Amino acid sequence: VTSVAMPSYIGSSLEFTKNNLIQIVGIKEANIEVVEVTTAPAGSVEGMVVEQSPRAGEKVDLNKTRVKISIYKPK
Predict the structure, then answer these.
(1) Paired sense of beta strands 67-72 and 49-53, if any
(2) How far apart are CA 5 and CA 37, in angstroms?
(3) How far apart are CA 56 and CA 38, in angstroms?
(4) 10 Å Cβ neighbour count for 72?
(5) How many angstroms separate the Cα of 38 from the Cα of each of 53, 67, 70?
(6) Which of 4, 15, 16, 37 pairs with 24 at a CA distance of 20 to 30 A?
(7) What are the extents of the domains in the chain?
(8) Distance CA 25, CA 29 (A)
(9) 23 φ, ψ to 5°?
(10) Over the range 9-38, which residues count as b (16 or more CB within 10 Å of their CB) and which as e?
């Protein structure tokens, strides 16, 4: 079975998170969706990962899972 635990990316930059998934975890670029969210916990920095699917430590299948990364982009 080619399923690993999802790293915790909350608080990291999008660039780090995307390239970690691709180069270290082995997720295909096609299976990463980036969404911008307008709200985030207090202290969040614009551009930072504030939510992720799968959640930290949950199963991610290297070929099946559609990874979703939410980035804080306030108005």
Answers:
(1) antiparallel
(2) 24
(3) 21
(4) 19
(5) 17, 19, 10
(6) 37
(7) 1-75
(8) 11
(9) -90, -25
(10) bbebebeebbeebeeeeebeeebbeeeeee
